[PDB]
Tab-separated table of C-alpha atoms in Angstrom:
chain	number	residue	atom	x	y	z
A	1	UNK	CA	-0.042	0.001	-0.036
A	2	UNK	CA	3.157	2.130	-0.131
A	3	UNK	CA	4.834	3.235	-3.364
A	4	UNK	CA	8.124	2.006	-2.019
A	5	UNK	CA	6.787	-1.537	-1.448
A	6	UNK	CA	5.408	-1.850	-4.942
A	7	UNK	CA	8.682	-0.725	-6.502
A	8	UNK	CA	10.547	-3.262	-4.409
A	9	UNK	CA	8.005	-5.954	-5.507
A	10	UNK	CA	8.753	-4.981	-9.151
A	11	UNK	CA	12.448	-5.245	-8.542
A	12	UNK	CA	12.098	-8.681	-7.002
A	13	UNK	CA	9.858	-9.913	-9.804
A	14	UNK	CA	12.463	-8.770	-12.255
A	15	UNK	CA	15.199	-10.562	-10.322
A	16	UNK	CA	13.230	-13.831	-10.164
A	17	UNK	CA	12.114	-13.774	-13.840
A	18	UNK	CA	15.761	-13.737	-14.998
A	19	UNK	CA	16.574	-17.226	-13.601
A	20	UNK	CA	18.655	-19.323	-16.078
A	21	UNK	CA	16.479	-22.343	-17.046
A	22	UNK	CA	18.318	-25.517	-18.000
A	23	UNK	CA	19.199	-26.267	-21.594
A	24	UNK	CA	16.478	-28.323	-23.168
A	25	UNK	CA	17.518	-28.967	-26.743
A	26	UNK	CA	20.316	-31.364	-25.655
A	27	UNK	CA	17.866	-32.907	-23.123
A	28	UNK	CA	15.419	-33.884	-25.880
A	29	UNK	CA	18.285	-34.931	-28.209
A	30	UNK	CA	19.239	-37.482	-25.570
A	31	UNK	CA	15.818	-39.096	-25.773
A	32	UNK	CA	15.927	-38.972	-29.663
A	33	UNK	CA	19.315	-40.784	-29.571
A	34	UNK	CA	18.047	-43.296	-27.175
A	35	UNK	CA	15.099	-43.979	-29.458
A	36	UNK	CA	17.413	-44.518	-32.383
A	37	UNK	CA	19.489	-46.952	-30.301
A	38	UNK	CA	16.501	-48.972	-29.228
A	39	UNK	CA	15.168	-49.060	-32.808
A	40	UNK	CA	18.502	-50.399	-34.078
A	41	UNK	CA	18.645	-53.084	-31.473
A	42	UNK	CA	15.096	-54.181	-32.142
A	43	UNK	CA	15.816	-54.261	-35.874
A	44	UNK	CA	18.758	-56.564	-35.288
A	45	UNK	CA	16.596	-58.842	-33.180
A	46	UNK	CA	13.798	-58.906	-35.851
A	47	UNK	CA	16.342	-59.748	-38.643
A	48	UNK	CA	17.793	-62.634	-36.625
A	49	UNK	CA	14.230	-63.777	-36.021
A	50	UNK	CA	13.492	-63.791	-39.744
A	51	UNK	CA	16.737	-65.794	-40.242
A	52	UNK	CA	15.031	-68.666	-38.356
A	53	UNK	CA	12.021	-69.418	-40.591
A	54	UNK	CA	14.138	-69.318	-43.662
A	55	UNK	CA	17.883	-69.570	-44.260
A	56	UNK	CA	18.618	-66.068	-45.590
A	57	UNK	CA	18.300	-62.528	-44.562
A	58	UNK	CA	15.819	-60.258	-46.380
A	59	UNK	CA	16.551	-59.654	-50.109
B	1	UNK	CA	-16.834	66.261	18.306
B	2	UNK	CA	-15.644	66.639	21.950
B	3	UNK	CA	-12.002	66.894	22.862
B	4	UNK	CA	-12.606	64.224	25.499
B	5	UNK	CA	-13.922	61.726	23.059
B	6	UNK	CA	-10.972	62.087	20.644
B	7	UNK	CA	-8.462	61.570	23.535
B	8	UNK	CA	-10.361	58.429	24.491
B	9	UNK	CA	-10.249	57.248	20.943
B	10	UNK	CA	-6.536	57.747	20.899
B	11	UNK	CA	-6.163	55.829	24.177
B	12	UNK	CA	-8.185	52.926	22.801
B	13	UNK	CA	-6.228	52.902	19.523
B	14	UNK	CA	-2.994	52.736	21.501
B	15	UNK	CA	-4.464	49.869	23.557
B	16	UNK	CA	-5.524	47.873	20.498
B	17	UNK	CA	-2.307	48.334	18.507
B	18	UNK	CA	-0.240	46.746	21.287
B	19	UNK	CA	-1.764	43.335	20.838
B	20	UNK	CA	0.801	40.523	20.929
B	21	UNK	CA	0.773	38.818	17.436
B	22	UNK	CA	1.778	35.173	17.477
B	23	UNK	CA	5.351	34.047	16.827
B	24	UNK	CA	5.919	33.555	13.109
B	25	UNK	CA	9.524	32.469	12.708
B	26	UNK	CA	8.841	29.114	14.293
B	27	UNK	CA	5.688	28.849	12.268
B	28	UNK	CA	7.585	29.155	9.021
B	29	UNK	CA	10.309	26.885	10.324
B	30	UNK	CA	7.690	24.206	10.757
B	31	UNK	CA	6.863	24.351	7.071
B	32	UNK	CA	10.627	24.418	6.155
B	33	UNK	CA	11.224	21.240	8.123
B	34	UNK	CA	8.187	19.531	6.611
B	35	UNK	CA	9.524	20.348	3.171
B	36	UNK	CA	12.916	18.824	4.145
B	37	UNK	CA	11.192	15.676	5.387
B	38	UNK	CA	9.064	15.269	2.206
B	39	UNK	CA	12.170	15.829	0.062
B	40	UNK	CA	14.064	13.110	1.930
B	41	UNK	CA	11.209	10.596	1.584
B	42	UNK	CA	10.846	11.338	-2.100
B	43	UNK	CA	14.572	10.905	-2.596
B	44	UNK	CA	14.479	7.500	-0.968
B	45	UNK	CA	11.649	6.522	-3.270
B	46	UNK	CA	13.413	7.724	-6.339
B	47	UNK	CA	16.619	5.883	-5.344
B	48	UNK	CA	14.705	2.617	-4.854
B	49	UNK	CA	13.092	3.271	-8.296
B	50	UNK	CA	16.531	3.509	-9.844
B	51	UNK	CA	17.557	0.285	-8.191
B	52	UNK	CA	14.945	-1.418	-10.426
B	53	UNK	CA	16.109	-0.736	-13.884
B	54	UNK	CA	19.732	-1.585	-12.960
B	55	UNK	CA	21.143	-3.634	-10.021
B	56	UNK	CA	23.124	-0.828	-8.189
B	57	UNK	CA	22.481	2.487	-6.600
B	58	UNK	CA	23.928	5.654	-8.263
B	59	UNK	CA	27.719	5.868	-8.378
């Protein structure tokens, strides 16, 4: 209710809004690379599964 | 219109002109001190305002 208090509130809000958030692009790239890894491993397993019914890999 | 009445008039005028007026120097000093007080408070508010755009007081 005092013009000093509101100015201090504005200053503290400006201080708090400048917090450095963590990097997110690399964080998501981690998940993307893990997805690629899992896909490759599952593809290897599926290919070796196919090599059981017949005696040759695809093509 | 009588020399007695005019003398009484002079006496009453002399009586009325001797009235003790209130002290005025202190009365004006009150306003001066209030002005100093308000100026100091406004200076504090302005300094805290400046401390919002930047993160340091002047100088």
